[PDB]
Amino acid sequence: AFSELLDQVGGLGRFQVLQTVALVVPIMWLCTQSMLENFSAAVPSHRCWVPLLDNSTAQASVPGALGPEALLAVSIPPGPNQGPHQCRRFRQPQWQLLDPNATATNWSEAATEPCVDGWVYDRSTFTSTIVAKWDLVCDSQALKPMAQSIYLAGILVGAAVCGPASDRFGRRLVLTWSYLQMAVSGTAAAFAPTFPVYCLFRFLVAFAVAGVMMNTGTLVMEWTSAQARPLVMTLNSLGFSFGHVLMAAVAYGVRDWALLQLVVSVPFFLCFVYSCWLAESARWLLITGRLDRGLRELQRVAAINGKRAVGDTLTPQVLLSAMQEELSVGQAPASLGTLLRTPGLRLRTCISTLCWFAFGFTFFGLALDLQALGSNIFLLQVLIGVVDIPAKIGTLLLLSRLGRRPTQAASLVLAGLCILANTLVPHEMGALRSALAVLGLGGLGAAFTCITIYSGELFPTVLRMTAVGLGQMAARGGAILGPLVRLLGVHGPWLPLLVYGTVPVLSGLAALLLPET
Numbered sequence: 203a204f205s206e207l208l209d210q211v212g213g214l215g216r217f218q219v220l221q222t223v224a225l226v227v228p229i230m231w232l233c234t235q236s237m238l239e240n241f242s243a244a245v246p247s248h249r250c251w252v253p254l255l256d257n258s259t260a261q262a263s264v265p266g267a268l269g270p271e272a273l274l275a276v277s278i279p280p281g282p283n284q285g286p287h288q289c290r291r292f293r294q295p296q297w298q299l300l301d302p303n304a305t306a307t308n309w310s311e312a313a314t315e316p317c318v319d320g321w322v323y324d325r326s327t328f329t330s331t332i333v334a335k336w337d338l339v340c341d342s343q344a345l346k347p348m349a350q351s352i353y354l355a356g357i358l359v360g361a362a363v364c365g366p367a368s369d370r371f372g373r374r375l376v377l378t379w380s381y382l383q384m385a386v387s388g389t390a391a392a393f394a395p396t397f398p399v400y401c402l403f404r405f406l407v408a409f410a411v412a413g414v415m416m417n418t419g420t421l422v423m424e425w426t427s428a429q430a431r432p433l434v435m436t437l438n439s440l441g442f443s444f445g446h447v448l449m450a451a452v453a454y455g456v457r458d459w460a461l462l463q464l465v466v467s468v469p470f471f472l473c474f475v476y477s478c479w480l481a482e483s484a485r486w487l488l489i490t491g492r493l494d495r496g497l498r499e500l501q502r503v504a505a506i507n508g509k510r511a512v513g514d515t516l517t518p519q520v521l522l523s524a525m526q527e528e529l530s531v532g533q534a535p536a537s538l539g540t541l542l543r544t545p546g547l548r549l550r551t552c553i554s555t556l557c558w559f560a561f562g563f564t565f566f567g568l569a570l571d572l573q574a575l576g577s578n579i580f581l582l583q584v585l586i587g588v589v590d591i592p593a594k595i596g597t598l599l600l601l602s603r604l605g606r607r608p609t610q611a612a613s614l615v616l617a618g619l620c621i622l623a624n625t626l627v628p629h630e631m632g633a634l635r636s637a638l639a640v641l642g643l644g645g646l647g648a649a650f651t652c653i654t655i656y657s658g659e660l661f662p663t664v665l666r667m668t669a670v671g672l673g674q675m676a677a678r679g680g681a682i683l684g685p686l687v688r689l690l691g692v693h694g695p696w697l698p699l700l701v702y703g704t705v706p707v708l709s710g711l712a713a714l715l716l717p718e719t
């Protein structure tokens with residue numbers, strides 16, 4: 203509402219605290235939904251099915267007993283990197299390779315049989331997985347990143363439909379609808395019998411995620427005081443930061459792809475239930491002509507804040523007079539035609555969108571394939587969640603006592619360089635490998651928070667929202683494009699990481715040209 207009304211009702215008080223907690227608690231269970239891919243779509247070791255071992259009759263037919271290690275060679279070509287071929291097998295058994303004296307070079311995949319009877323996955327760490335369920339290996343390997351991209355695509359669609367809709371129906375209504383949509387879509391995805399059905403439900407879940415994010419952010423921004431809008435927006439982000447730790451904790455308990463999804467998505471039903479008691483933003487109600495509901499909402503907030511006499515004295519006449527400043531000046535959003543046309547503003551917007559896209563691309567291309575960064579995924583997730591908090595908190599202090607531009611450049615460049623170095627280190631040493639990956643991810647989070655604080659300040663007041671929205675769209679597009687880099691993994695696992703580490707470095711170096719403050 204207007205400053206005078208929000209002051210007579212109370213800037214920061216009990217109701218603020220309550221609504222912020224209510225709206226931040228779901229953010230953890232939404233970061234869990236976003237990061238569920240790491241655990242529900244893990245890729246375990248997958249040898250090729252062979253009748254000799256799986257079928258006990260053939261194995262028992264041979265007199266005596268033969269060790270599995272020796273009997274696997276006679277039916278699996280020696281694959282690259284001194285290991286069994288994951289997608290090939292021997293068409294017929296070859297006892298010649300059984301003798302260790304003979305060199306195994308002659309035994310190769312020249313006359314190997316492509317997997318016909320299916321794959322045998324390991325269940326030591328994951329009882330079941332999407333990859334092990336729908337055989338997303340070998341020829342279908344590329345289908346794994348695609349499912350991650352489509353989900354991200356949904357987010358881009360959600361922000362494209364939850365913007366105007368929320369501006370015509372409200373924030374509380376769309377928030378409740380998105381909560382229920384997320385709950386139902388996540389519950390239904392657990393029972394998907396085919397890959398396309400699961401992908402469609404994941405896309406709907408992403409739609410709901412975008413809706414929830416935008417609506418909760420807008421409600422928090424509107425119901426908070428002017429001097430603390432970015433602060434509580436960064437609190438919204440810190441909720442996701444702790445959702446990382448929540449995801450790490452939940453995965454270690456349930457080892458499955460359906461039970462994990464169901465447990466992750468079921469709390470959103472309770473979210474929808476209690477979401478019917480939140481407060482619709484009074485600002486939107488007043489500017490959109492809803493006066494009685496706005497008055498009721500303001501009185502409710504004031505009573506909750508402990509001021510009943512102040513609310514009792516409010517009248518529609520004063521309510522309209524307070525909002526006359528906004529009613530008379532009917533600010534309409536400005537199109538990009540008045541933004542990119544000015545030559546003196548092109549470089550700023552270009553660099554801003556470059557930074558937004560670089561983060562949205564590298565971060566979500568790296569975090570989705572968390573297995574490639576380190577040794578085990580649980581420790582990586584826990585450390586990411588633990589470290590992203592202090593980095594984000596310290597970024598604010600750096601901004602306070604240091605310029606915005608140098609902090610942005612340093613954070614982005616250091617994150618990119620750490621990601622690049624993570625690839626160069628020998629693969630045997632996993633400790634520094636995971637440490638460098640964690641430091642790079644924390645630096646990326648710090649850079650994201652810094653750019654979020656920075657983007658609004660460069661552009662004038664009138665054009666700030668257009669530039670912010672353009673940056674968010676660029677970040678979502680980069681997120682969509684991020685997983686597609688892993689498609690360039692057939693050449694080697696190093697190329698995707700090299701791309702992911704080279705992009706942030708160049709973006710940071712470019713981010714030193716835009717003016718300070």
Ligand SMILES: O=C(O)CSc1nnc(Br)n1-c1ccc(C2CC2)c2ccccc12
Binds near residue numbers: 442
């Ligand atoms: O705007 C807000 O309310 C803050 S959202 C936030 N917090 N940490 C992070 Br990473 N992000 C996020 C930042 C950016 C994105 C988009 C895809 C490019 C995200 C997409 C899904 C989930 C979190 C996201």
